[PDB]
Amino acid sequence: MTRDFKPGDLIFAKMKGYPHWPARVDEVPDGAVKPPTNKLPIFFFGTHETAFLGPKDIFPYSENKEKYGKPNKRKGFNEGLWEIDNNPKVKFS
Secondary structure: OOOOOOOOOEEEEEOOOOOEEEEEEOOOOOOOOOOOOOOEEEEEOOOOEEEEEOOOOOEEHHHHOOOOOOOOOOOOOOOOOOOOOOOOOOOOO
């Protein structure tokens, strides 16, 4: 949907030209980190990456977790996938 999301929410981020993957939503930048224009901060778990994608691009993990629950051809499998439903705030460690 177009509706915005909340900080630290579990949602499968879909990168242009890539399958769905369980990531974590981040908060706004300090104010001078060059924020997005029509997208939100998406912290890719397992790969420690970050991609900017709008709401219509990101879907609820509640729908993907029921599909396979884990990545098929995506690196990072079993590397933070169980934390998405347990320790979603591992980035801080």
